A = this chain, B = another copy of it.
Amino acid sequence: TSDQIVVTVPQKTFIGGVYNSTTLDNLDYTPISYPLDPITVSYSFPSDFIVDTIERPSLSSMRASVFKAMRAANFSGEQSLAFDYNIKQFSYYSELKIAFISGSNNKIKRTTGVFAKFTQKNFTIDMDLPADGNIFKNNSDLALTNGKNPVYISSVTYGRLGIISIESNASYNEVNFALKLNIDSNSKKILEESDLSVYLVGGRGTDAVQVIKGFAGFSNFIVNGGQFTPEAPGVPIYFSASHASDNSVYYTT
């Protein structure tokens, strides 16, 4: 059970949207088309337009409200909300130098791997609890959707994601043999393999495209985007939903 759900359908992941719990669990996202009361939304970052109101919860309305809030006066993206980092570096080595009519066998093995995951939560837009205690305007739709598990998203997190994975393998198989008749034999085998997989969600495009240069771009893509600017608001990465019956926190498995 988790409180925050990773955004998988950006189109349907907007604040104030009502869905079925089962559909949200299996990534179907079947909406519940019923009227809803106007919702009050608040932003984690300090701004003049920190408390907005949306009559009809929709993706376009949420995007427009975020745009206006982050372009308003007294806006500061200087402080973020969360920053998780994790790196795992590993490096094996192997060397055999068997020697002995003559004979030699030199084997060298190398295996290097760096795996890095990073997430940053620039800010979140949160939804206020209804004054009437029910999100629905008619207040009878709650009884109408009995068995449909009405659950509405109440928080959307804007931030950046980044995953990198660099692997490398090296093999050396020198073999020498002499029978000084002057029979001679040599066998050299060098095998080199490399891999580098990157997955970035959001952030500055110029710094994002520089991660192709090994573990150097994925060292400035992070340090050049710590403060989120209104030109780079971030991407919805996580969201939280709550039950529509008792307004309790919805937990998914």
Contact = CB atoms under 8 A, between A and B. Distances in A.
B30 A248 contact: yes
B222 A188 contact: no
A208 interface: yes
A95 B184 contact: no
Interface in A216-251: 219, 222-223, 225-235, 240, 242, 246-249
A94 B80 CA distance: 43
Given A3-B8, A249-B28, A186 B86 contact: no
Contacts of A61: 51
A235 B193 contact: no
A123 to B, nearest CB: 10
Interface residues of A, number: 124
A6 interface: no
Interface in A1-53: 3, 8-12, 17, 23, 27-31, 33, 40-44, 46-47, 50-51
A206 B227 CA distance: 6
Contacts of A145: none
A208 B80 contact: yes
Nearest to A122: B205
B80 A183 contact: no
Contacts of A82: 199-202
Given A3-B9, A197-B85, A99 B222 contact: no
A207 B182 contact: no
A88 B231 CA distance: 34
A23 B248 CA distance: 8
Nearest to A47: B67
Given A90-B192, A210-B223, 15 more contacts: A10-B126, A11-B155, A31-B247, A31-B248, A46-B233, A50-B64, A50-B67, A78-B206, A85-B212, A86-B198, A92-B189, A92-B190, A207-B226, A208-B226, A212-B219
Interface of A: 3, 8-12, 17, 23, 27-31, 33, 40-44, 46-47, 50-51, 56, 58-61, 63-64, 67, 70-71, 74, 76-100, 118, 120, 122, 124, 126-133, 154-155, 182-212, 219, 222-223, 225-235, 240, 242, 246-249
7 contacts: A3-B8, A51-B63, A86-B198, A91-B192, A96-B185, A97-B184, A212-B222
